[PDB]
Amino acid sequence: SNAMILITGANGQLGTELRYLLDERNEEYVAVDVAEMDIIDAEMVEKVFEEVKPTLVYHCAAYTAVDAAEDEGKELDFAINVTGTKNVAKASEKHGATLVYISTDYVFDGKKPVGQEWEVDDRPDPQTEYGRTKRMGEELVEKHVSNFYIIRTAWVFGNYGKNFVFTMQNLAKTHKTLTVVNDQYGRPTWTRTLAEFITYLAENRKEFGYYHLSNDATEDTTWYDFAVEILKDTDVEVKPVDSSQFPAKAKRPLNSTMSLAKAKATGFVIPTWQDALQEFYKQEVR
Secondary structure: OOOOEEEEOOOOHHHHHHHHHHHHOOOOEEEOOOOOOOOOOHHHHHHHHHHHOOOEEEEOOOOOOHHHHOOOOHHHHHHHHHHHHHHHHHHHHHHOOEEEEEEEHHHOOOEOOEOEOEOOOOOOOOOOHHHHHHHHHHHHHHHHOOOEEEEEEOOEEOOOOOOHHHHHHHHHOOOOEEEEEOOOEOOOEEHHHHHHHHHHHHHOOOOOEEEEOOOEOOOOOEHHHHHHHHOOOOOOEEEEEOOOOOOOOOOOOOEOOEOOHHHHHOOOOOOEHHHHHHHHHHOOOO
16 A cells, blocks of 8 residues: 655755655655665666665655766766666666656756746756756656656755755855845745655655646745845845856856746645745754
8 A cells, every 4th residue: 555665865955854754754765875776877776676666766866066067077967867867767667666856947948037937848948967967867757657757846955955045054154245146036945845745746646747846936036035035134234246246167047937836736835935944944953
């Protein structure tokens, strides 16, 4: 009756959040990261799948160092996002398992007008190596696994890894003014909300396919706006700057705001990003 669950990328932000959520729900799982199952090694992937025989796979393993992916991390970006996804998808296909794959706003070109939102059926056109390999991963999942969920997320933060929230908090400890870009739009996503959503889809047998999940927002939101709120109770003044002030290697999307309509139509409740931050600060971290 109960699903046998495999979590890949178990040590990452989402994987950790997810393990702790399943623990709270007294749901058993097998958690793997690099040490227990090299996703690049197909034989290994098939061996572990034959050992565990999962009915449901949460594939959270990913390479996400966007600037590095352009050059020094390019081989590992491809190996983890393409080859790793291929191996997990094929092993899922063979074992008849449902596969949940976490993807990214970076599959899009970021040119969506501000005030508009990426829908699940918009055409990917990634302008970065990270986005290119994640989109290849999406296609592999859709190709190999009939019983799939692909959830694109963005601006991910939580208590179980490095992220923009901790970065801004740390900077503010020793600076009374900070600059943050104000021409890149999107919405934060708390890993707890994301973990609750992906389990909600799978546990309730919602329709297979693509979904977009971030926290919600009542206004067009930039990194600057996010920082202002993070630091609202801190003795610091955040100042807005344009993207030309800090030239990054990888092209950052101007607008990654995603439509939450399909996710909401499943009955899932999505907190605003401001409310999610408050829940984040409260969390009795493990």
